[PDB]
């Protein structure tokens, strides 16, 4: 029983490292692409709700 | 075929006229009665009801009444409307067109 736990933990530790590395790589790739293509990811100008118009749908 | 017969139904009162219906073992039967009655009635229902009765202002219902009194006193003293149709200040709003 001791080796069952140890075996799972040992293998699980390295799979967790690779998992975290692959998501870090995914974020690293995504931010670089956004940085290199600012025209496709413009910083839109946000408006406030006082300015934006939303239709009212009464529940009656 | 090679099947056991259907057993006859057992009346727990025959072997134990004092049975509480919990177990055929009299000592276990009594203990199981006590936990149900003590943790069920003495604790959960009695202490739980007391706990619920003294909840500190469930969902600030009491605070809202005190707050409403404060606003009504202030707004009537100063000749303001008790309540306004507009929830949001129109000076902060910008209608289309």
């Amino acid at each position: 029983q001791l080796l069952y736990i140890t075996s799972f933990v040992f293998v699980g530790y390295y799979l967790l490292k690779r998992q975290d590395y692959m998501y870090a790589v995914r974020d690293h790739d995504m931010f670089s692409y956004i940085k290199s293509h600012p025209e496709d990811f413009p910083e839109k100008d946000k408006k406030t709700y006082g300015e934006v118009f939303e239709e009212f749908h009464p529940v009656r | 075929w090679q099947e056991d017969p259907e057993p006859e139904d057992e009346n727990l009162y025959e072997k134990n006229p004092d049975s509480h219906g919990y177990d055929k073992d009299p000592a276990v039967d009594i203990w199981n009665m006590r936990v149900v009655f003590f943790f069920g009635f003495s604790i959960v229902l009695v202490l739980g009801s007391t706990f619920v009765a003294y909840l500190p202002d469930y969902r600030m219902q009491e605070w809202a009444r005190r707050e409403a009194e404060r606003l009504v006193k202030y707004r009537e003293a100063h000749g303001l409307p008790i309540m306004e149709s507009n929830c949001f200040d129109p000076s902060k709003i910008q209608l289309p067109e």
Binding site: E54, E55, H57, V59, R60 | P7, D9, N11, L12, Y13, S19, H20, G21, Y22, D23, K24, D25, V28, W31, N32, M33, V35, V36, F37, F39, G40, I43, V44, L45, L47, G48, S49, F51, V52, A53, L55, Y58, R59, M60, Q61, W63, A64
Partner: protein, 459 residues
Amino acid sequence: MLKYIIPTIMLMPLTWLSKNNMIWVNSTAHSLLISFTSLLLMNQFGDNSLNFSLLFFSDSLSTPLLILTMWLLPLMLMASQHHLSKENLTRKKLFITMLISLQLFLIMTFTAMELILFYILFEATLVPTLIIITRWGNQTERLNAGLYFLFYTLAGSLPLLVALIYIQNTVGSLNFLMLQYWVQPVHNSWSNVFMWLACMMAFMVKMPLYGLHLWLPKAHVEAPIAGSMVLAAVLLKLGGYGMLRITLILNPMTDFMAYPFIMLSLWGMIMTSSICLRQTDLKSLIAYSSVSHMALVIVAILIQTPWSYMGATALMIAHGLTSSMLFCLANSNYERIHSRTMILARGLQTLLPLMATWWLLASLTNLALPPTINLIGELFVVMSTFSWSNITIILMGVNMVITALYSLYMLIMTQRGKYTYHINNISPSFTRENALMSLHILPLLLLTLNPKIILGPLY
């Protein structure tokens, strides 16, 4: 929520490591302590919900359902231990384990912030429930009842899975707190009609909606008593709870998409109430009574008004305790006469006086006698549907007449008249049975003194 999840999990090693004859004593005692601690969830604020972490949250809707869920486990254990007395020990422990795992899934289902997490746990409740019915049910038909229960649910849930994943891609999140702020109106199109249906039909089958209900009477007739208690008290409410949450993101399309389901529920409640007058099986009668009551909940949820959401929440809690009580009352007769036929054993008030009082109290709550929370919930729904359309008062009024008729007819047929001559094994009520009945009705009637805690977030 970990202060409830972990102790619930600990009930499993507790059961398996208990002495052979202390499995019922230990699991019942400690699941009552958990139920006691569940009252700490009453720390509810007037503006903010109680948001514990990224995964779990409670508000006024989930809190009463959580307390009902955790209170029902000890009751299911007392209800089950008699008819499982001849089972071998390992199989008794497995039965208790299925009940514990069902509670674990339920308390996580009601507190999940993220809707896919809700979906998975909402779906996970199927497995133990199916196992309980098919493994520990009594008769041959339990295998078919398991199949109808499984596939009715999956026929609805799988489209819901597609819709939820679609929603996250478009919106970017399924966290319910985020959806409260990022929600956008649903515009008219055929794409959104099917998105609306995929978001709702799974919960409708759970309620169940009239026309999708025929699985419920089969399941109840076949399930063991604990299966019936959890099915009626909590599992039906997963549909109600799901609809109460997901309707946030279906506006304004719900304004017209609700009509076919309001007509089914408004008419369905009259038909199921009338059906109750002619049922011959006592468990089947109570199952049809549940469909009638849950029809109001569907209507209340669909018309989306503060009063109806308060009525829906109160009805869900009141129905849970009442219907679970009725099944326990019916079961106690069954454990004596081994038949569910309502006409078989009559005049039982003459032989079991106190148990006849439990029948009377249970029936009075079922027909919603003021000021029970059963009436408060029903009255609030009737008030709100009157504003929706004045004509509905006629359908609501007729249902209240028929509901009183079958509630008392069930009481009169089984408890009054002349006792059946040849039935001579009607032994006196056990302390376990009387305690089981009073642990339903006493919390139910105590809630009348403080209804606000079951009126939900709109209070």
